[PDB]
Design an enzyme around this catalytic site. Structure first.
Site, PDB file in Angstrom:
ATOM      1  N   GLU A  92      -1.923  -0.949  -9.295  1.00 22.38           N
ATOM      2  CA  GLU A  92      -3.189  -0.549  -8.374  1.00 22.38           C
ATOM      3  C   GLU A  92      -4.390   0.909  -8.167  1.00 22.38           C
ATOM      4  OE1 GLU A  92      -4.121  -4.136  -5.696  1.00 22.38           O
ATOM      5  OE2 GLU A  92      -6.266  -2.899  -6.062  1.00 22.38           O
ATOM      6  N   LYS A  94     -13.838  -7.397  -7.735  1.00 20.67           N
ATOM      7  CA  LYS A  94     -14.537  -7.101  -6.326  1.00 20.67           C
ATOM      8  C   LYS A  94     -16.114  -7.603  -5.885  1.00 20.67           C
ATOM      9  CE  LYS A  94     -11.595  -4.460  -4.105  1.00 20.67           C
ATOM     10  NZ  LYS A  94     -11.156  -3.433  -3.126  1.00 20.67           N
ATOM     11  N   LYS A 142       0.630  -1.267  -0.173  1.00 18.09           N
ATOM     12  CA  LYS A 142       0.221  -0.113  -0.498  1.00 18.09           C
ATOM     13  C   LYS A 142       0.978   1.090   0.027  1.00 18.09           C
ATOM     14  CE  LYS A 142      -4.475  -1.756   0.008  1.00 18.09           C
ATOM     15  NZ  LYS A 142      -4.591  -1.449  -0.481  1.00 18.09           N
ATOM     16  N   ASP A 149      -0.631  -0.068  -4.416  1.00 17.26           N
ATOM     17  CA  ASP A 149      -1.798   0.017  -4.582  1.00 17.26           C
ATOM     18  C   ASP A 149      -1.643   1.570  -3.893  1.00 17.26           C
ATOM     19  OD1 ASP A 149      -4.240   0.477  -4.580  1.00 17.26           O
ATOM     20  OD2 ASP A 149      -5.361  -1.368  -3.410  1.00 17.26           O
ATOM     21  N   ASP A 152      -9.768   0.315  -9.832  1.00 17.34           N
ATOM     22  CA  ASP A 152     -10.417  -0.858  -8.621  1.00 17.34           C
ATOM     23  C   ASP A 152     -11.937  -0.157  -8.001  1.00 17.34           C
ATOM     24  OD1 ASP A 152     -11.541  -1.887  -5.989  1.00 17.34           O
ATOM     25  OD2 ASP A 152      -9.292  -1.770  -5.330  1.00 17.34           O
TER      26      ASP A 152
HETATM   27 MG   LIG Z   1      -7.377  -2.141  -4.374  1.00 15.75          MG
END
Ligand SMILES: [Mg+2]
Ligand SMILES: [Mg+2]
Lengths: 341, 341
Positions: free
Chosen positions: B214, B263, B159, B186, B239
């Protein structure tokens, strides 16, 4: 798991010669597909190859029986996605790809204790098909249209494409004697872009409405399909131009058509499922058609339509045009209505 | 037929606070969904609502239990497409839409004597998930990354997004202590277009490869996602920008991204299936992710991935970051590997 696969030639004669732009058929030569599972379950499918559209020849399909057998035996039908990916390699034999993929679902559904339509969603319990009026003299066309109308059909598919003037006359004469019915006009690539536009405008000017105007121009003329869509009043559909999921993504990107006539014989179950999803994710609408399938073959499309419930119109009448001793569909045929058992 | 639908609050605490751009969570509040059939069969799903991404709030989901019951009670799960269409109306409660749709398939699969993954194609028998390194000091990040690597994970999700300078440093340090691993970075919308590009170039210059980059920019900045895709060396994924099948069709038309992180919590099963087909019909590639699902919730994505086998990468580690007494997934967790029972 699949322990064997068998291909068999099955010929059906048309009640009367079927004439469409650039093609007259007196017989429908199909390839029946039977899949045998270790459990004893047998799944069936039917390939109705098209030389004109898919470039296929029945002799060629029958010639690769051993290859198909080697490709899928040993695979469990519960892993049908694997069978789909493998059969996707049969892009040169799409009607066979379709027959094998459906036979797979047919066998799987039996093992699970349900029907193919339910495996696919069980969206609808009933659908209605139109019936086709082949190319003939205006007089004979009108006669057939009146007959189809009396049989209860309320969506009449009219073939055109070889004579603009006479095609216009034919549609106008058919409309007058079938008030209450909706019409699908199919040119099977017979018109130039401008002729296609003029045909639509002439009919529109007489106050006649066309529900779907199928493939007015040549298959590679994507820009032409769009031109007709943007310059004539009726929804335009791609048939010959829409064979694979990739063809459809392009059609959508180009905004070339209002409709796509999905045919398992062109796409197989795999691409048809992709096309349904693409259509539901865009402004595209769909109709489901057929080629020369017999009742066993049309059954594949009936279950696909009932399960997905993705079609605005259904042109599943090939089996009604062929002479067949025993009905072999796994659905109930009630006039123009088709229901699940 | 469905006779009961139950929603219930389930709280799970993170082993350690989870920090991502603009969000720190120490607890995950989910809504468990149970569907009961007249036969006694029980299907289960889990909603992990997201205020940040979907605009949802757990209290809101719980408040509409009666409405959900009224929407699908009495419907037979074999007509699951009807339940899907109805639940698609819950676009304002996407995580609940997802839980209900999966619970429907979970129940249906049981009635058919099979599993959800097989109902969806049974494409794969095993998949592997990465594990995430949240935002923290470079020292703690490298420490966690090293710990994850030692656990057997060969794909590490890092991240970033709040400090370009430190983010670059963090990725560079992590890479040197985890040689042999692939990396997914991400930013959770934290960077501007230019910063996103600079990040990728900085990392690229050190000889580091990023498998998936991402959502570098804000969710509405589709042009920005495209800008980063066309001006930086790594595959860019949407995303937050990719929630529905319509969002994806647009991303594909605009050629905005190389990847889409699907997702179920954003799209539900219905839209997720559409996105899979769209991706397979275009140059788009996919990865499957999660939000704050517990093992019961991650089970939904494991079955979706195994069945469709449509993902190049799997980021299904939320349950691995939560304290959970008993495993509740209908799958086998073997280190980074997840398999069908
Ligand atoms: Mg993500
Ligand atoms: Mg046609």
């Amino acid at each position: 798991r699949i322990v064997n696969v068998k291909l068999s030639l099955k010929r059906y004669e048309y009640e009367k010669p079927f004439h469409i732009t650039g093609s007259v058929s007196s017989e429908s030569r199909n390839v029946e597909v039977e899949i045998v599972l270790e459990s004893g379950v047998k799944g069936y499918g039917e390939a109705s190859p098209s030389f004109r559209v898919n470039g296929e020849r029945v002799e060629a399909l029958l010639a690769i029986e051993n290859a198909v057998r080697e490709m899928i035996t040993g695979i469990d039908v519960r892993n049908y996605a694997r069978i789909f990916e493998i059969t996707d390699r049969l892009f040169g034999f799409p009607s066979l790809k379709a027959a094998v993929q459906f036979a797979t679902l047919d066998a799987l559904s039996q093992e699970l204790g349900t029907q193919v339509c339910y495996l696919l969603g069980g969206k609808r319990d009933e659908i209605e098909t139109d019936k086709t009026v082949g190319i003939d003299t205006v007089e004979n066309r009108v006669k057939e249209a009146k007959k189809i109308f009396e049989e209860g059909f309320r969506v009449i598919k009219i073939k055109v494409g070889e004579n603009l003037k006479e095609d216009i006359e034919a549609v106008e004469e058919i409309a007058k004697v079938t008030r209450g019915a909706k019409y699908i006009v199919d040119a099977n690539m017979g018109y130039t872009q401008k002729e296609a536009v003029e045909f639509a405008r002439a009919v529109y000017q007489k106050g006649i409405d066309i529900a779907v105007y199928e493939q007015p121009v040549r298959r590679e003329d994507i820009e032409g399909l769009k031109f007709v869509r943007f310059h004539s009043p009726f929804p335009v559909a791609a048939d010959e131009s829409a064979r694979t999921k990739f063809d459809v993504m392009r059609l959508v990107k180009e905004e070339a058509v209002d409709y796509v006539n999905i045919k398992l014989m062109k796409s197989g179950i795999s691409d048809a499922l992709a096309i349904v999803e693409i259509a539901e994710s865009s402004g595209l609408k769909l109709m489901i058609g057929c080629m020369g399938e017999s009742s066993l073959g049309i059954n594949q499309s009936v279950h696909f339509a009932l399960g997905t419930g993705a079609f605005e119109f259904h042109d599943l009448d090939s089996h009604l045009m062929l002479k067949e001793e025993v009905f072999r569909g796994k659905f109930i045929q009630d006039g123009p209505r088709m229901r699940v058992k």
